[PDB]
Ligand binder design. Structure first.
Ligand SMILES: Cc1cc2nc3c(=O)[nH]c(=O)nc-3n(C[C@H](O)[C@H](O)[C@H](O)COP(=O)(O)O)c2cc1C
Ligand SMILES: Cc1cc2nc3c(=O)[nH]c(=O)nc-3n(C[C@H](O)[C@H](O)[C@H](O)COP(=O)(O)O)c2cc1C
Lengths: 200, 200
């Protein structure tokens, strides 16, 4: 009974306490397959995910996340990383299958030229930005399936790269702890609509 | 009959041709109120939205977006901008209402200190990243309500800032054209799950 998207967005709160029940791999795969349909500029999809269930690795990530207890307690921690260089080395995988021959090359050169003119920090920030569209899809879908989650930026990226063996060029836009909820979550407010939106 | 979140994510395609029917302001406000419940680091919510319906302004934005015709043809264009300095000047609006007295100050100083040590480009990229979580929520909700959309980065940000009178420090993570669909949209692929996800 997956929830409608409006109820999911209005009811979500971050959850930091979880039941001890495992999350079935079949259920996780259905959620990730739907979240990976998120759109990105030029269909580049620079996002990459590590699903961490091993207890020793979760304990190591808890230390990298300044001791946040939910990293170790949740049944599953997702590491969302962005690898622009892996995307650019495999551009034929993201170009539309109908766009072939000479059209494919012109699209591929325009993309390579745009990124050849950018530094390492700018590339990481661009690929991280696109990865946050996928994060928005994933948080709404986790709520719609009845799972709780907390996205995190409070961690040392150098330690996370070392524990998992990630490339030095990768950016890590978030860790996400998830599982079946054992708490309601705290009420949080948002700015009034009229403070954020201007009508023209 | 808002769609369930899984069907919305799996069926969405970008739409670039629209009917001439207007989008009622009451319907737009319900969608934006649900999308503005997206989460952000420290609840900072650095996103700001301009709803553009004026025909002359849409024509000016079409030129700024290198002539993309859907900017002028859609009934509504949303301009998503990020203003980190406006968020930091009003930190009392985002701090939890129960966190008062001395606790409020310690939270506010930690936030101000983190951003005082960053340059203008880094601040814009950080606020743009958080704004893409809201973009993910908004694209899924527009599909769930039966509207079509296309998010865009193909535009000159200096021209958009001038047309709307935005601050020089603002980043513009996307323009979004939307309306009732007049086309099915093109089929697009995503990478295989096993290419993007590693199980540990
Ligand atoms: C990108 C990002 C990073 C965040 N980092 C942390 C974190 O490191 N630890 C934590 O407990 N919550 C963290 N949060 C949770 C946010 O504080 C929270 O989403 C926000 O206060 C609104 O609360 P809600 O998610 O309950 O609606 C983060 C959220 C996002 C979107
Ligand atoms: C941040 C962003 C910027 C994009 N910019 C443009 C644009 O300037 N013009 C356009 O026609 N489509 C643009 N697109 C649409 C993308 O090409 C498209 O989302 C992707 O090819 C997958 O197609 P789908 O959205 O139909 O699933 C953009 C998408 C995103 C997410």
């Amino acid at each position: 009974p997956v929830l409608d998207a409006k109820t999911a967005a209005l009811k979500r709160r971050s959850i930091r306490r979880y039941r001890k029940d495992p999350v079935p791999e079949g259920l996780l795969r259905e959620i990730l397959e739907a979240a990976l349909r998120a759109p990105s500029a030029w269909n580049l999809q620079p996002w990459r995910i590590v699903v961490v269930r091993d207890p020793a690795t979760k304990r190591a990530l808890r230390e990298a996340a300044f001791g946040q207890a939910h990293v170790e307690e949740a049944p599953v921690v997702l590491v969302l990383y962005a690898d622009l260089e892996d995307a650019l080395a495999h551009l034929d995988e993201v170009i539309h299958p109908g766009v072939q021959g000479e059209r494919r090359e012109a699209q591929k050169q325009a993309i390579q030229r745009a990124f050849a003119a950018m530094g390492q920090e700018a590339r990481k920030a661009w690929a991280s930005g696109q990865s946050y569209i996928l994060l928005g899809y994933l948080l709404l879908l986790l709520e719609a399936y009845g799972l709780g989650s907390v996205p995190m930026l409070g961690f040392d990226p150098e330690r996370v790269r070392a524990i998992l063996g990630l490339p030095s060029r990768a950016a890590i836009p978030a860790l996400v702890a998830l599982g079946y909820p054992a708490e309601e979550g705290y009420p949080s407010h948002r700015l009034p609509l009229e403070r954020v939106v201007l009508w023209r």
